[PDB]
Amino acid sequence: IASACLYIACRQEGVPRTFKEICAVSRISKKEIGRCFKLILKALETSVDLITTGDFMSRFCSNLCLPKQVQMAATHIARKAVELDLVPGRSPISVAAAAIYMASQASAEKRTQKEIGDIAGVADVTIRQSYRLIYPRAPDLFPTDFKFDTPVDKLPQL
Amino acid sequence: AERGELDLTGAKQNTGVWLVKVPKYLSQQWAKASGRGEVGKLRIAKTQGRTEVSFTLNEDLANEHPFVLQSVGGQTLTVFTESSSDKLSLEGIVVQRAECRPAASENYMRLKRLQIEESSKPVRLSQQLDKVVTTNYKPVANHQYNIEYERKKKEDGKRARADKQHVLDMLFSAFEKHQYYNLKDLVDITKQPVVYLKEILKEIGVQNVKGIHKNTWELKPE
């Protein structure tokens, strides 16, 4: 209950923490936290705002030690990807990690899918799938006022 | 005749030996070149009213060590050994004591500094870290110990309910080993559900307060 309450508090505060992050600090598994989560919402007759791609960019980019411009580009890419519906049904964490990977690979500070996956809590396959969906539209997702260390046309294709 | 008997030939023949104190680096080189048998030469010079001892290290091993003698009259020292064949013996009595020192002094302090620096290498000091550690509490779906414990629990499965006759046979088999047992131990011994076990046990056995550390059941049916 305490672990699930901590997740709800983070959501209410506008600083969502993924279930994998809350699980990583608690002896309770993601599954049990997820079960208690919905039960508490019913018990409290309350609800929490839907998570968004921008809620994790600050934490993930800082944990990855990415420059400010890379974090801004990743935020824009993820936001535009959701608006363009390029990632239907994809979890926002997977989209954020994929957007971070794209922006990182386009910048001087290049991070691998494993490094981003370990910090974001997403499998490299899930990142790769989410990245493969957004890669064709990469020039539209990147900001117009962004400085490219590696041009969008040379971004990794897979 | 006993294992502890000492061969006192060293004392009987009055074998005299010299106890010499030498630096660790010097004896380390002798141990390294031990297979050569040419670690150096020991020179002793005596005069009308003065005597000196010194050692010269082999050039190849080095690539004069004056010795200062010390009195042996203030305390009686003897040398003894234990053979690998479990036979003790006394080699002799210390008739002279000396200590090795270097001839030079200024350059010798350089060697001591080098030895100190080498001896300082194992002294671990707190390291300053330029970037915060971001790998702690990395996001995980379920802990390693939990999936392992869950797998063992699910693979082994829950404890089944044996037939009443087999449960009674196990209970009486346990009674042959001991008169009374703690319920927790009895559950592990009989390998039955605590509820199911208690139902069968209460029909014959009983629980009574005893001086043992935990509440124990009495298996005698009467």
Question: For residue B137, what is the nearest residue in chain A, using CA coordinates?
Answer: A24
With a CB-CB cutoff of 8 Å, which residues 54-93 of chain B face chain A?
none
Measuring CA to CA, which residue among A97, A5, A98 is closest to residue A56? A97
**Method used to solve the structure:** cryo-EM
| Helical residues (DSSP H) of B72-193, grouped into ranges | 108-120, 144-156, 164-177, 183-190
Pairs from A3-6 (Cβ < 8 Å, separation ≥ 24): A3/A28, A3/A32, A3/A33, A3/A36, A4/A33, A4/A34, A4/A36, A4/A37, A4/A39, A4/A40, A5/A40
Q: How many CB atoms lie within 10 A of CB B111?
A: 13
Mutate to test the interface with B, among A64, A118, A122, A127 (most CBs of B within 10 A): A118
- For A131, list phi and psi in degrees, rounded to 5: -65, -45
Q: Does B140 touch chain A (CB under 8 A)?
A: yes
A48-155 CATH: 1.10.472.10
Which tokens belong to A136?
A: 């064709």
Q: What is the C-alpha separation between A77 and A102, in angstroms, rounded? A: 9
Locate breaks in chain B with C to N over 2.5 A; list the residue preceding each.
63
Resolution rounded to one decimal, in angstroms: 3.8
Q: Does B146 touch chain A (CB under 8 A)?
A: yes
Cα distances from A104 to residues A60, A109, A154, B38, in angstroms, run 12, 6, 13, 66
Q: Does B142 touch chain A (CB under 8 A)?
A: yes
Q: What is the C-alpha separation between B69 and B51, in angstroms, rounded? A: 9
Pairs from B202-210 (Cβ < 8 Å, separation ≥ 24): B204/B168, B204/B171, B205/B171, B207/B183, B210/B180
Contact across the interface for B142 and A65, Cβ inside 8 Å? no
* CA geometry: angle A86, A92, A93, nearest 5 deg: 125
**A72 Cβ partners below 8 Å, 6+ apart?**
A143, A146
A53 is in an annotated binding site: no
Q: How many CB atoms lie within 10 A of CB B68?
A: 13
Rg (C-alpha) for chain A, rounded Å, is 16
Shortest CA gap B154–chain A (Å):
16
Q: What is the C-alpha separation between A119 and B132, in angstroms, rounded? A: 14
User: In three state form, how does the secondary structure of B61-90 look?
Assistant: HHCCEEEEEECCCCCCCEEEEEECCCEEEE
Q: What is the C-alpha separation between B90 and B77, in angstroms, rounded? A: 11
What class has domain B156-218? mainly alpha
DSSP class of residue A152 equals G
Q: What is the C-alpha separation between A19 and A37, in angstroms, rounded? A: 10
Would you call A83 helix, strand, or coil by DSSP? helix
Q: Does B129 touch chain A (CB under 8 A)?
A: no
Q: What is the C-alpha separation between A21 and A19, in angstroms, rounded? A: 5
Q: Does B141 touch chain A (CB under 8 A)?
A: yes
* CA geometry: angle A21, A22, A26, nearest 5 deg: 120
- For B48, list phi and psi in degrees, rounded to 5: -50, -40
* CA geometry: angle B205, B209, B215, nearest 5 deg: 75
C-beta of residue B200 within 8 angstroms of C-beta of residue B164: yes
Shortest CA gap A150–chain B (Å):
26
**B125 Cβ partners below 8 Å, 6+ apart?**
none
Residue A45 zone, left/alpha/beta (φ > 0; ψ -120 to 50; rest): left
Measuring CA to CA, which residue among B48, B56, B51 is closest to residue B26? B56
Would you call A40 helix, strand, or coil by DSSP? helix
Rg (C-alpha) for chain B, rounded Å, is 38
Mutate to test the interface with B, among A18, A63, A111 (most CBs of B within 10 A): A63
Contacts of A64 in chain B (CB under 8 A): 134
Mutate to test the interface with A, among B140, B145, B154 (most CBs of A within 10 A): B140
